[PDB]
Design a protein around this ligand. Sequence first.
Ligand SMILES: CCCCCCCCCCCCC/C=C/[C@H](O)[C@H](N)CO
Lengths: 56, 237, 300, 300, 170
Amino acid sequence: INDSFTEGGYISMFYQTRVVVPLSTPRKMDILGFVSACNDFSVRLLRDTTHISQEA
Amino acid sequence: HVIQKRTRSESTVESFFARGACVAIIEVDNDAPTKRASKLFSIWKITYKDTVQLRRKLEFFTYSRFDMELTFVVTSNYTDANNGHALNQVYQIMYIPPGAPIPGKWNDYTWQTSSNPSLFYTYGAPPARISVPYVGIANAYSHFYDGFAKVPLAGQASTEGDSLYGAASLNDFGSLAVRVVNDHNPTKLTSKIRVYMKPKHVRVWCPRPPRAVPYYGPGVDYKDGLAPLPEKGLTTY
Amino acid sequence: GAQVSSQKVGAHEINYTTINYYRDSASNAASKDFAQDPSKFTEPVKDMQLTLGNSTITNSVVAYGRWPEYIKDSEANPVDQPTEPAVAACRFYTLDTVTWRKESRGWWWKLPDALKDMGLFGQNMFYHYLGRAGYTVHVQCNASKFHQGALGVFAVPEMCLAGDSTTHMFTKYENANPGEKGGEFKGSFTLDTNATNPARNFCPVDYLFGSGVLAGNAFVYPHQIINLRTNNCATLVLPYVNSLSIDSMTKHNNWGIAILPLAPLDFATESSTEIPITLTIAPMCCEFNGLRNITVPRTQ
Amino acid sequence: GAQVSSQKVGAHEINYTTINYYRDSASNAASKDFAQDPSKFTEPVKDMQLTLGNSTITNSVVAYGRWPEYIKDSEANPVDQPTEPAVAACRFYTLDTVTWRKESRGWWWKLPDALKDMGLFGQNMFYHYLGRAGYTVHVQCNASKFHQGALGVFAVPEMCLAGDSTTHMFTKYENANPGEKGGEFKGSFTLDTNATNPARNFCPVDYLFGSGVLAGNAFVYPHQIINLRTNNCATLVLPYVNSLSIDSMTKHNNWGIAILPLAPLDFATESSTEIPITLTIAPMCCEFNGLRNITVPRTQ
Amino acid sequence: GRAGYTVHVQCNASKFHQGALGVFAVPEMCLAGDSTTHMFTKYENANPGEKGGEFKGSFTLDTNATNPARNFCPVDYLFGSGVLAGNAFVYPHQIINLRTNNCATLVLPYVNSLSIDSMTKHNNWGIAILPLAPLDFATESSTEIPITLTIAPMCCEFNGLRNITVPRTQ
Ligand SMILES: CCCCCCCCCCCCC/C=C/[C@H](O)[C@H](N)CO
């Protein structure tokens, strides 16, 4: 959950240099992000999720 | 250097499904049969899709194979203060596999249960419980079936050859018939049997992305909650 | 016959005994870095020229790390002799080329549905009661070094798509099996309200992946990315996947192919730009059972 | 797998068997002169000249008999490389000298709070997410042979002090972390009734040891007595104490130092007499993790 | 204090850009002044920090005898020290040619007449980036590309701990 005492830190992206394109090239482009766990990743205390609910 | 002694014991597929999830609330009544608003027996088509939580957990995967532990928690109450009291009730839960005769009355011959497995539960006893092996006619349970049970052939009318999309007899497990065995007291009693389903000895295949919008029917249809994600700035921590 | 197992002690101040009382095992209680623990679930590659039959093709994933294979005698349900067309049916067939524009929301196909009218493979499929085959799917999309765009190709077992009506599971057989033309994803869900002549068609929303799941997670399925700056094509090797060793090919589609534009197509400064996408699918390790008169499913 | 243990028979007119039925050990039932049995809880001494870094000091307790030590690889939670400043941070820093009068009720400090502005130790503390260190605390108080008085120096792990308001746990971060000035105990509890601009400060009552416990029992904590007729100083060697191998130094204070006048100061016949008390603290076995931009906590 | 360095100069441009940069690591990089007074550059101007300074195409004499700038005047073709720039290649160096490579890495060991010195008083190395071939692109006379420096000190070791030094600024 969102908990101050166990907050995980911050992630950010910046331009180191700028993006350079020649003429006749798109000047705007897209990047995609993916996240996964490493092999040292574990979880504990199975619980019901808040991402699904049943009205009535 | 760090010694990494952390195990994934609780995230195994066995531990993930090692809980009793409620899949059915079956309502039955003990009352004079002359009364028409009282339902003296109830039939429930066995399935896990009446509720969402266990369904969502199971649909993380395409195929599954497991034994099933069913637990029955029975509660009852008076519907009226007058008209006296009642003695302890006994409940019959008869499993009707597809093809077996379905009771039409609360006291017809089918309740003899000469061959159908039947469970007799005494109110106030600990919740009833039984186990079932893997009973699929295929080699695994199909949580998803991208096909039809019928193939409409050229020439036959639009009425013929029509079947629901994604429906097959792979998930036809029969039903549960529930009744109160006692004759009616002068007062009406209402009972609810809650069915809790636990997969054990579990194996799963072909993981899938979990449901992200509200379930709509037994299929994969969606209608209403189609904007699950909230607003959050691109550069806002 | 007591089973003495060891406990994993946590808070310390170590063996527990269990005995099975029932003959049926279903009565038993439960017994309980970059390297990927599930190497087979992270789209393993085939680690050129692919030749099948008389067809040759000159970025290859093996779905679940399982190459197509014939039925083992240990797992054969049917008892009649299996027909294996071999090179006659196991060859690359090229479907109709689609057009990728800046506005495309994606395309989908079903297997074996997309190959039902493909040479002798379709004949064998419609002449037999039971059929089985893996696939090699080759998606081709080439563009200049000045084009930008990315396609995600996903092979989904039991790719069930949502309908377009309040009636559940109402998509009719004809619309669920379009053949080699396939279908297209949509950017929004439109409800079919024609109660007189319902379309009875799918309404696959792209960001919902057509099945109520977020598209971002579709990467859990076997997949490959065609990034125009890097590669032209994508090869997916799909083994036969089903709860049965062999099934009806006319009733059931074992795989679905989904192509979604992850990054929209763009080029120089021409807002009008389109590049073709061509699918070439070769069935593999085909085997059929139950020969009789040919099936002729209803159309339109 | 039965466990046959022996009973201790009392009234005589002898073994009992136990079997664990559950896989989880949490389900198990409980199994059950001057020499001090807990030698480590009776303030063991270091049985001169203490040199740390470039600092030298010329009555020393080791709290719980445990010398400061670095994290064992067996008990390291964080995975990134640990920064160990060594002599740069591990050195004696002298705090502001306080004045002991006949009316003083005592003084208190928090560690690592009191050293947050001490050379490179403070820089390392505020530059890293995680920090760990033991301490050597040297309390200095000298007086003539004609002075009388006694000070009790206590090192308290998790020294939580009571507030001054009806609102529970209402002491704000700024007042709970005063730095090297520390704070003073009070002879009585005064309730803060300013509901508009509450002080949000501690009200540590001396005889309650500031936490609702009788001061006489504070000797259960690691401690040393400076009796003016006997000794000038007191040395306390504090190991890192916490429920974690390493924590946030800005969020959490691992130790608290309390100096209480056990016997009031007195001298000849001068009612006006004051002697300084000087604290010199050297952090020991410092190690830090999680380097990023520097933390700048709010002040006043 | 003592430390070597790893200097990473980064400059990326399209295949249609042309230009070359010479990166030089100079031990004891002393730069000429801007006045008739010898060795008159003051400490503040000789230690600008991460902003550094720029070479000039010509030598301009500071004639403000009332408020002298007391700054360097490093002429590019004189390499800022009275030597021809063409010979600067005798120093450790790397060329970033835009048609070939994006970056340049220089690994500098500690260089001095002493095993360790004062870091505030003395600068052990100087980094100079000179455009050997001018930047150009297509037919846009207005073209600019960033250059980013990333420096990691290496094998740092310090001695003589005391109160912190606070040098005068501006
Ligand atoms: C003896 C009377 C009590 C009731 C006895 C119940 C026996 C019938 C229950 C077995 C049928 C369900 C088997 C498991 C099917 C699952 O719901 C899904 N296929 C899982 O994918």
